[PDB]
């Protein structure tokens, strides 16, 4: 199992602009376009991204393309952040994929705010860190997702995802 698969499972694959959990204009596998309430903007943004006049529609190829750029960017972001790099580093392979998941979903900045959670993690304190994790808007907002990650963190296995 891997980040690409795991992520494609939480994100799904959409080929037409759509709105996400917050009503933001998105596309393909979790590729956020804009935070504006306007489609055009949104439309505008996809075109600039794919580099062509899409008219809010892309191919699977292209969707997987953004996904790569997106994954790649995420890892990199984690890698150049002083609150994550260390965490990342201390963690094992399965759990690293999890940091990635989260960053992906919420922004590096978003995730760098789980200070307490991040610490438990550093200390390799699974049960504690999972309890902490659950006390978030993130958790209350998109429950099923949180639960897979949180559970993966506690176990280190891809069960939740099997
Ligand atoms: Cl882009
Ligand atoms: Cl969910």
Strand order of the sheet with strand 25-28?
A: 14-19, 25-28, 31-34
Is residue 18 classed as helix, strand or coil in its secondary structure? Answer: strand
* CA separation for the pair 130, 117 (Å, rounded): 8
The yes-or-no answer on residue 20 being catalytic is yes
Structure-token pair, residue 114: 């789980």
Residue 136, annotated as binding a ligand:
no
CA atoms within 13 A on the CB side of 87: 30
* CA separation for the pair 108, 157 (Å, rounded): 24
Structure-token pair, residue 36: 């504006």
Q: Residue 74: which of 40, 49, 48, 99 has the closest Cα? A: 99
* CA separation for the pair 136, 151 (Å, rounded): 15
| Domains in the chain, number | 1
CA 69 / ligand 1 centre spacing (Å)? 7
Alpha helices in the chain (DSSP H): 3-11, 39-50, 60-79, 85-90, 93-106, 108-111, 115-123, 126-134, 137-141, 143-155
Q: Which domain holds residue 160?
A: 1-162
Q: Of these residues, 5, 10, 11, 64, which one is catalytic?
A: 11
Non-local CB neighbours of 156 within 8 Å, separated by 6+ positions: 92, 94, 95
CATH number for position 5: 1.10.530.40
* CA separation for the pair 64, 157 (Å, rounded): 26
* CA separation for the pair 80, 90 (Å, rounded): 15
CA 144 / ligand 2 centre spacing (Å)? 4
Q: Of these residues, 10, 20, 64, 128, which one is catalytic?
A: 20
Non-local CB neighbours of 71 within 8 Å, separated by 6+ positions: 3, 4, 7, 100, 104
Structure-solving method: X-ray
């Amino acid at each position: 199992m891997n980040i690409f698969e795991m992520l494609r499972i939480d994100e799904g694959l959409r080929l037409k602009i759509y709105k996400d959990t917050e009503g933001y204009y998105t596309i393909g596998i979790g590729h956020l376009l804009t935070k504006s309430p306007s489609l055009n903007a949104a439309k505008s943004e996809l075109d600039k991204a794919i580099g062509r006049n899409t008219n809010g529609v892309i191919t699977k190829d292209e969707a997987e393309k953004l996904f790569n750029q997106d994954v790649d960017a995420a890892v990199r972001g984690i890698l150049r952040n002083a609150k994550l790099k260390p965490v990342y580093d201390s963690l094992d392979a399965v759990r690293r994929a999890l940091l990635i998941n989260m960053v992906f979903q919420m922004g590096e900045t978003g995730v760098a705010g789980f200070t307490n959670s991040l610490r438990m993690l550093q200390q390799k304190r699974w049960d504690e860190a999972a309890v902490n994790l659950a006390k978030s808007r993130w958790y209350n907002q998109t429950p099923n997702r949180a639960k897979r990650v949180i559970t993966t963190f506690r176990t280190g296995t891809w069960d939740a995802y099997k």
